[PDB]
Amino acid sequence: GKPLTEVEQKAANGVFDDANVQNRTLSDWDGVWQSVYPLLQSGKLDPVFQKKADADKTKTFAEIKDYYHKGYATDIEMIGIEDGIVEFHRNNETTSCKYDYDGYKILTYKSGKKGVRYLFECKDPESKAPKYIQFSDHIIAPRKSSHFHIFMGNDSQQSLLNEMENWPTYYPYQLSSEEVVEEMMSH
Ligand code: NA
Ligand code: NA
Ligand code: NA
Ligand SMILES: [Zn+2]
Ligand SMILES: [Zn+2]
Ligand SMILES: [Zn+2]
């Protein structure tokens, strides 16, 4: 999409006022999405971790890698979103549901940076998909997503709000691996 404005870029970097946060519809995440965890597993994220580790004098390669290892770990390799339905692929198995939007929650991290979780819930008694999901993607108002983090669970939304360490990360499926690493190198 368009280059971000200064304000949007500050928002993407966790600086924004709560009054500027707006609701978003599920279609912002429409598409087919690939988990980045297999890139980590195959060693393809080594140069990202090397770059980050070289830049940060306070962190070693291992600490950076462990951080993203804990972050990206998931068995959900693919997520498809269309027509109000989210479908989750785990090995050869699929689940799906027509998710109902439930608003957003603004979180403040220890650093004082902030982030917005967009909440959805599955109320279809026949579905085996996660009852609760939350999207977080460095965007606080309607805009098609470039990559997203998703929190998935069956217990409560607060349970997912409490999750800070694991944030399964998804990029558009149409991107080649080189393209994904290229984007990651710039973050
Ligand atoms: Na299902
Ligand atoms: Na799941
Ligand atoms: Na992130
Ligand atoms: Zn370092
Ligand atoms: Zn991200
Ligand atoms: Zn992106």
Side-chain angles (χ1 to χ4, degrees), residues 136-138 147 149 169:
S136 188
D137 66 354
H138 317 294
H147 81 259
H149 308 276
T169 297

Side-chain angles (χ1 to χ4, degrees), residues 50 52-61 63-64:
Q50 298 237 341
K52 290 184 179 283
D54 287 334
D56 187 339
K57 314 301 162 194
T58 79
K59 300 286 169 291
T60 60
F61 179 95
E63 296 169 335
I64 297 289

Side-chain angles (χ1 to χ4, degrees), residues 57 75 89 119-120 124 138 142 151 164:
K57 314 301 162 194
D75 58 359
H89 295 245
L119 272 56
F120 295 82
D124 171 8
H138 317 294
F151 302 83
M164 296 286 193

